[PDB]
Ligand binder design. Sequence first.
Ligand SMILES: *[C@@H]1O[C@H](CO)[C@@H](O[C@@H]2O[C@H](CO)[C@@H](O)[C@H](O)[C@H]2NC(C)=O)[C@H](O)[C@H]1NC(C)=O
Lengths: 265, 127, 50, 99
Amino acid sequence: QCVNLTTRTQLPPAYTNSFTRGVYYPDKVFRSSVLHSTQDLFLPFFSNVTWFHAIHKRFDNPVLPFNDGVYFASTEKSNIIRGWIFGTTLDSKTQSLLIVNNATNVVIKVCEFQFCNDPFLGVYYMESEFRVYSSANNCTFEYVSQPFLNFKNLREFVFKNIDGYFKIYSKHTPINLVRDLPQGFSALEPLVDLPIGINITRFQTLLALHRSGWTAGAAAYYVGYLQPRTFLLKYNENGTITDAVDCALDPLSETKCTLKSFTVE
Amino acid sequence: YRVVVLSFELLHAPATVCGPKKSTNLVKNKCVNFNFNGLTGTGVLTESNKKFLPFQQFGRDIADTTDAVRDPQTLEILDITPCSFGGVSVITPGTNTSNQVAVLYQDVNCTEVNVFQTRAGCLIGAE
Amino acid sequence: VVNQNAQALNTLVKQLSSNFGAISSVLNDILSRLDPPEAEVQIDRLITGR
Amino acid sequence: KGIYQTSNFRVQPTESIVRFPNITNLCPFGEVFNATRFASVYAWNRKRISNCVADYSVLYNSASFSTFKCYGVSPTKLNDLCFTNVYADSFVIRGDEVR
Ligand SMILES: *[C@@H]1O[C@H](CO)[C@@H](O[C@@H]2O[C@H](CO)[C@@H](O)[C@H](O)[C@H]2NC(C)=O)[C@H](O)[C@H]1NC(C)=O
């Protein structure tokens, strides 16, 4: 079942500032009271992240590139965001990954789905509408897991795909800010690793409609891209990352990165 | 006759299905060889006070040498200490005077070798 | 004086995890994964670097 | 008269230790070998095995199997070689045609 929605109000997407968001633990090594230097795929400081809305009428669900990895943030209340679609052609020709969070459980499936042009779900005022795929023939991987999940919640995710391993890092934050991303520091702990071994170059997000035509709940999300660079991370005595320095932002940061210190004489 | 044939495909995808892993018993306070999930070494394993985060497995020091580990069977933290080593020196007067000697084991406790415990090591053969 | 001595000693300890053009910087891994005829060449590279 | 450094003292390891996580989610071989019914020769049944750990020692040591044969791998070395996936094709034939 595929349903095309034609009540959208045309408007370009917004842009906003990253601040110092998108830092994750690069490995599983405990370190205490250390300044460590790591080179990896990170979100550069003060970068321009794309802002997509869902307000009423706005219903933003376009096909986006994946590049070398994706930072996904969602400022959320009342649980509109649900999951993601990953793959290269997003049809039955090749193998695609589907991560869904319905009202009960989190379902990860690697199959050859036939995806509709506008996949979505529906909430009745209870969930009784699920129009994402029409068929799914060859399933190589299945995984049922625990649920991951003014705006009140901030959900941050990092998705990577290296040597056939899909890595997902996640973090949840209680905020009280309305429109833009809050400014601060938080490290993203590893959430899951899947040995799917498939190519990914495009991805979709999944939203839930509100029927009482149709209405989209007030939601907003931001997308940023990862690039290879060197960071200087600060591990405190309990082994938590509490600060970072981007060694390519400006000359003072490069001085700090060469001196391996957060203070310079 | 009932016949079942098993075929194994090994492709560029990550390995997924294969045999179990046989674990031994865990012994502490002794110089042993050890293997923890493929991390191999030699040393003495003792009880620790460090508290890892639930996703962490290893522990490194400033010079990037492993010094703590988590037991995969029971999620407990163990410290790793190198096995004792040192120099052995002979204290003698001249052979023109006597043939008596004393021996110094450097940086070694006296219980692991007229036994006198100095800060320089363990001295045997001297009063 | 203290800082220079500590820094030199740290550099010496850190140089021990470089492979110097071999396959690995761990002697045990090379010994357990390759045979003596070629582990000999790899080990010789490690020895000259160290 | 003096003190001379003559030797080096080194303590030697006593035992050897190997530790690994608990064995869980074993591959369901009993779903194939102990099936209530089987398939014909021309329409043999295929099953995929992945995302589990498989123990062939219990399968090998059973005395209920008349023929257990293969050439490219020695059966005692099947507990460590680690593969992408396993295919199981089952059927029923004549006793003479097993060869
Ligand atoms: C198929 O079923 C039989 C019978 O249930 C299994 O044989 C038993 O295996 C257990 C192992 O714990 C032994 O204690 C019993 O003595 C066995 N009984 C008989 C009659 O053989 C057999 O292992 C099963 N095969 C598979 C592949 O699951």
